[PDB]
Amino acid sequence: MRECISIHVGQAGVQIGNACWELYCLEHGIQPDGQMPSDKTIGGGDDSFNTFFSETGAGKHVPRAVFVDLEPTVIDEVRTGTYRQLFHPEQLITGKEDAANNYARGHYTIGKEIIDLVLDRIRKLADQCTGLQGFLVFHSFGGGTGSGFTSLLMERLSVDYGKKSKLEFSIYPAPQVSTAVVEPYNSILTTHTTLEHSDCAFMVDNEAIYDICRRNLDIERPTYTNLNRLISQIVSSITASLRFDGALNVDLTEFQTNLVPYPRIHFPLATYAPVISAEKAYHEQLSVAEITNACFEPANQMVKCDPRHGKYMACCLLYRGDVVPKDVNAAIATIKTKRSIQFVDWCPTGFKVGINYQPPTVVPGGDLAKVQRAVCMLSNTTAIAEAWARLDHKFDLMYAKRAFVHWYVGEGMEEGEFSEAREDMAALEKDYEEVGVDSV
Amino acid sequence: MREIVHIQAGQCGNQIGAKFWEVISDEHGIDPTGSYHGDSDLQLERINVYYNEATGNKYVPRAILVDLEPGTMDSVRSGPFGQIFRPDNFVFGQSGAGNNWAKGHYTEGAELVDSVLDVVRKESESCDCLQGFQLTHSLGGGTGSGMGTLLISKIREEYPDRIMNTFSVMPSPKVSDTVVEPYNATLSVHQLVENTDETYCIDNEALYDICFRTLKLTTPTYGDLNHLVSATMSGVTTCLRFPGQLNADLRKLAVNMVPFPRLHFFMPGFAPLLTVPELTQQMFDSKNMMAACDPRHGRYLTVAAIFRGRMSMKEVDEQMLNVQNKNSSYFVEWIPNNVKTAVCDIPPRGLKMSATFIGNSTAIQELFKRISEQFTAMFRRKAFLHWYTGEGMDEMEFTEAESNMNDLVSEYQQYQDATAD
Amino acid sequence: KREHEREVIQKAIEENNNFIKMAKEKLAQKMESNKENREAHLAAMLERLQEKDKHAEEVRKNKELKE
Numbered sequence: 001m002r003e004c005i006s007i008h009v010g011q012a013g014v015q016i017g018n019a020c021w022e023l024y025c026l027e028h029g030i031q032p033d034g035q036m037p038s039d040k041t042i043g044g045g046d047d048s049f050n051t052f053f054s055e056t057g058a059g060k061h062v063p064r065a066v067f068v069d070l071e072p073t074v075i076d077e078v079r080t081g082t083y084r085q086l087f088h089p090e091q092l093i094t095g096k097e098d099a100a101n102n103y104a105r106g107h108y109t110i111g112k113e114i115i116d117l118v119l120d121r122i123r124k125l126a127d128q129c130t131g132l133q134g135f136l137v138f139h140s141f142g143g144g145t146g147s148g149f150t151s152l153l154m155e156r157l158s159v160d161y162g163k164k165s166k167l168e169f170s171i172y173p174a175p176q177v178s179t180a181v182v183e184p185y186n187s188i189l190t191t192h193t194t195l196e197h198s199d200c201a202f203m204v205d206n207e208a209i210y211d212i213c214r215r216n217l218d219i220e221r222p223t224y225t226n227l228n229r230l231i232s233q234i235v236s237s238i239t240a241s242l243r244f245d246g247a248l249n250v251d252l253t254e255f256q257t258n259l260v261p262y263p264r265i266h267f268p269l270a271t272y273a274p275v276i277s278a279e280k281a282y283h284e285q286l287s288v289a290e291i292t293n294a295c296f297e298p299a300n301q302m303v304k305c306d307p308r309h310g311k312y313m314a315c316c317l318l319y320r321g322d323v324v325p326k327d328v329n330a331a332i333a334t335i336k337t338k339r340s341i342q343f344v345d346w347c348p349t350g351f352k353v354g355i356n357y358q359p360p361t362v363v364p365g366g367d368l369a370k371v372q373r374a375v376c377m378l379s380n381t382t383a384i385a386e387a388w389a390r391l392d393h394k395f396d397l398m399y400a401k402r403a404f405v406h407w408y409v410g411e412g413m414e415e416g417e418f419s420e421a422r423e424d425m426a427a428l429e430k431d432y433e434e435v436g437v438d439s440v
Numbered sequence: 441m442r443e444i445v446h447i448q449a450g451q452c453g454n455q456i457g458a459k460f461w462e463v464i465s466d467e468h469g470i471d472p473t474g475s476y477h478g479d480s481d482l483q484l485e486r487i488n489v490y491y492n493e494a495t496g497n498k499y500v501p502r503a504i505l506v507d508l509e510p511g512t513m514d515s516v517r518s519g520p521f522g523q524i525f526r527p528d529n530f531v532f533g534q535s536g537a538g539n540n541w542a543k544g545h546y547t548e549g550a551e552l553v554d555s556v557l558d559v560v561r562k563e564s565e566s567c568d569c570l571q572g573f574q575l576t577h578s579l580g581g582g583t584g585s586g587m588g589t590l591l592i593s594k595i596r597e598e599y600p601d602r603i604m605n606t607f608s609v610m611p612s613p614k615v616s617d618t619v620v621e622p623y624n625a626t627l628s629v630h631q632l633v634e635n636t637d638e639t640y641c642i643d644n645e646a647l648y649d650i651c652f653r654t655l656k657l658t659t660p661t662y663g664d665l666n667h668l669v670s671a672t673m674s675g676v677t678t679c680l681r682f683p684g685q686l687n688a689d690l691r692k693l694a695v696n697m698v699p700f701p702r703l704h705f706f707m708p709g710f711a712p713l714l715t716v717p718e719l720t721q722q723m724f725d726s727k728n729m730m731a732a733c734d735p736r737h738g739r740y741l742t743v744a745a746i747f748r749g750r751m752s753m754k755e756v757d758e759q760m761l762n763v764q765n766k767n768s769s770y771f772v773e774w775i776p777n778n779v780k781t782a783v784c785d786i787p788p789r790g791l792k793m794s795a796t797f798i799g800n801s802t803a804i805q806e807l808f809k810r811i812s813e814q815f816t817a818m819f820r821r822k823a824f825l826h827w828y829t830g831e832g833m834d835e836m837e838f839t840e841a842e843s844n845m846n847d848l849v850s851e852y853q854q855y856q857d858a859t860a861d
Numbered sequence: 862k863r864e865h866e867r868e869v870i871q872k873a874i875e876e877n878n879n880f881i882k883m884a885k886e887k888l889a890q891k892m893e894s895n896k897e898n899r900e901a902h903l904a905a906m907l908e909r910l911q912e913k914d915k916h917a918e919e920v921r922k923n924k925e926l927k928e
């Protein structure tokens with residue numbers, strides 16, 4: 001019951017899926033062959049982890065996930081990797097030719113040739129659910145598949161499943177690890193298209209994650225492996241309420257009620273703590289107070305922006321591990337008298353708190369230290385519009401000269417689609433200004 | 441899974457094509473007999489890009505050798521790595537081109553183009569997912585220029601949704617074979633602008649200057665010039681042939697490098713001719729360019745840099761940021777993050793580490809201005825036009841080719857003077 | 862009050878159905894518009910290449926009328 005189906009699109013989506021599903025298996029004690037010795041109920045069950053894992057007669061715990069990419073090289077590694085026995089072959093879908101960082105190829109030219117197959121595979125998962133809650137879609141903004149095909153998928157999912165909840169984990173493009181120049185185009189295009197088809201989207205700035213890995217983990221040159229393992233921890237924190245049962249546990253949908261005041265305003269800012277190496281975490285225990293303080297340090301945000309220069313519409317604290325309400329309340333009280341937390345005048349200023357007793361786990365051979373407690377803050381701040389602003393500006397610089405647009409027109413797109421997508425972004429930025437203005 | 445079909449036409453095209461397969465076979469551990477005797481599995485992971493796997497674990501180059509005379513192609517079969525090529529892929533004529541573009545594109549070359557296309561189809565249908573094509577040729581000759589551009593047009597018909605790239609060799613009076621080369625070049629460019637996605641301008645004048653001034657060679661031969669071409673071609677194909685952080689085919693490469701369809705003529709670079717800052721600074725040095733153009737006389741639309749060898753990834757990022765800041769004026773502002781960097785662990789033969797440069801600069805107009813200047817100097821007096829009008833051409837077609845290349849120059853100047861505001 | 866309860870839930874169904882209808886139509890419009898545009902793009906490209914054939918035949922014909 002209340003099953004969640006994950007869909008990982010493109011290179012970024014797939015590889016992030018790898019990290020998350022590896023992390024999930026470690027959290028639930030699931031072996032790479034799919035076996036779970038602790039699970040006494042054979043064949044099925046109504047346990048909390050069953051929302052993400054289905055069960056077979058042989059006791060194999062199978063991820064409710066679909067991996068999609070327009071080229072095979074990335075998903076092939078999953079087919080031959082450590083967790084190859086974890087996924088049924090039908091869950092791993094590949095094409096021959098990618099979208100070449102072209103939104104048009106991902107949404108039209110190449111994407112249309114595989115979209116029916118993908119939906120069919122998704123339908124096979126949905127039919128195994130007794131009460132499907134919704135979808136979790138993992139993709140990049142800058143890739144042709146992660147942008148183009150995702151938007152096509154989100155559109156089709158709205159048709160096949162109505163208003164069944166769809167959540168995004170989106171990878172915001174950053175120069176440090178980006179290898180494409182047209183990513184602002186693909187980003188604006190996919191954001192405009194999925195906007196009315198997405199209930200909630202967690203953006204992850206690659207530069208923010210890049211910085212955290214360098215600053216807090218002493219990594220000179222962070223790889224995708226470095227970034228993804230950190231990203232998986234945030235994703236785990238966000239989905240922990242769905243996968244674990246607890247007394248102090250607060251469902252994600254309940255947080256979502258506070259996080260989304262208007263349909264278009266559905267981009268929460270995520271902040272995670274503690275991110276610390278084993279060398280620095282040795283003989284140094286980080287309390288509830290300390291990790292809660294770190295949430296309001298901008299250097300720990302998933303997205304680079306300044307909440308101090310914006311206004312809050314919601315603040316959620318998702319704790320996990322050795323954490324009791326008493327310490328949380330004390331920590332919050334201290335913060336509320338020191339930090340620059342400014343709320344809009346039309347919403348309460350309280351902090352919504354959740355606690356999962358299950359302590360954080362780390363991937364073996366990783367950089368993150370094994371901490372007793374961790375916290376992920378999800379806040380709705382107008383400051384996240386800065387991420388739109390930086391991206392929209394890069395868009396305008398190239399489009400004024402119509403740079404690279406011929407690659408899109410050649411694949412069947414029109415200039416009207418670009419301007420329409422940009423105007424939507426303009427309205428979106430304008431929407432974030434309007435919600436911050438005080439009432440009459 | 442991502443295959444490339446290689447085509448070489450004319451004297452120049454085959455000789456630089458031969459050297460290309462020699463260098464990359466050495467890097468992939470392929471002997472002239474076609475067997476593999478390397479030491480790394482990274483030499484075979486993307487081996488299918490340029491090689492076919494036949495009976496007996498042989499790696500046969502997916503290459504098609506074309507010419508209108510047996511002369512040059514016979515030297516390939518007898519030279520090193522001669523028995524490695526597929527014998528049926530040898531398509532040669534007899535009558536020759538006589539250094540005439542008209543005979544290459546309209547008369548002689550058109551009588552042989554179908555037999556070449558048959559070999560292309562056979563190679564293309566054996567591909568799981570064909571990326572596209574790469575052509576090595578000269579623009580100042582007859583076969584490589586005339587029939588080379590002819591092949592492009594015919595392939596564009598049968599494979600319009602494939603990438604068409606060329607390694608074109610620009611004619612120079614310093615290494616001039618004839619005197620009618622400005623005509624052949626201009627006519628070739630007139631075709632390249634319309635029917636190619638990427639074109640590498642291997643300028644002979646630049647090659648001669650490097651050998652003479654930098655490599656200290658008083659009497660440079662074609663063997664000396666092609667040594668620079670081989671090293672350059674080996675570098676620009678590195679990320680395609682080797683496993684790395686970059687997962688991109690010809691199409692994805694073109695998307696990041698070509699902001700405007702016509703403006704797709706790149707300035708190759710190489711270093712050295714040793715620390716990462718030094719390697720980076722030399723890579724952007726105008727004396728290390730394979731095109732006789734000063735990048736500080738124009739602005740960069742897009743830049744692709746490739747580092748090879750074991751080095752500090754952190755230091756590479758630091759130096760690439762450092763050069764952009766200190767030289768911001770030479771990078772257009774209306775294209776954010778137009779400089780990309782790739783790194784391969786495997787260095788070229790003989791070097792600890794190297795760097796290959798691919799620049800899309802507006803300063804390449806200097807190369808076209810040079811050709812146009814030599815072109816119009818002959819066309820204004822109707823010199824040697826009987827060679828072309830005798831094959832069926834007219835003066836109108838010459839004027840159109842001249843007008844198209846002059847437009848290309850105006851276009852490069854437009855975006856050079858373009859500003860963000 | 863009972864008939865108001867009916868009107869609310871049937872308004873929810875109507876809005877949900879219209880959203881699905883709009884999405885299906887907008888998508889059908891886009892995939893059709895794209896198909897026409899991409900075909901026309903390749904149609905124009907091949908027609909130019911077929912024009913080069915017409916020009917090439919005239920070249921060989923013009924030379925033939927010189928012998």
Ligand SMILES: Nc1nc2c(ncn2[C@@H]2O[C@H](COP(=O)(O)OP(=O)(O)OP(=O)(O)O)[C@@H](O)[C@H]2O)c(=O)[nH]1
Binds near residue numbers: 171
């Ligand atoms: N955080 C993170 N970002 C990634 C990862 N892989 C790719 N990206 C980002 O994704 C963007 C490029 O899109 P990709 O996902 O790699 O490409 P794709 O979705 O497969 O689309 P096509 O290759 O064009 O078919 C770049 O901005 C990368 O920084 C990853 O493993 N982790």
Ligand SMILES: Nc1nc2c(ncn2[C@@H]2O[C@H](COP(=O)(O)OP(=O)(O)O)[C@@H](O)[C@H]2O)c(=O)[nH]1
Binds near residue numbers: 451539582583611615
């Ligand atoms: N770098 C280099 N240039 C060459 C070579 N052979 C010919 N060229 C150049 O190509 C031009 C003549 O083209 P050519 O080879 O005769 O073309 P073809 O008529 O098709 O055989 C001259 O300007 C030469 O400078 C070579 O082996 N290396």
Ligand SMILES: Cc1cc2nc(/C=C/c3cccnc3)sc2cc1C
Binds near residue numbers: 605781
């Ligand atoms: C951005 C970027 C682009 C790029 N393009 C290359 C050329 C490939 C090629 C090889 C043979 C024929 N035609 C094209 S290498 C390269 C490296 C980077 C980082």
Ligand SMILES: [Ca+2]
Binds near residue numbers: 041042043045
């Ligand atoms: Ca069970």
Ligand SMILES: [Mg+2]
Binds near residue numbers: 071098099143145
């Ligand atoms: Mg990809």
Ligand SMILES: [Mg+2]
Binds near residue numbers: 451581617
């Ligand atoms: Mg010759």
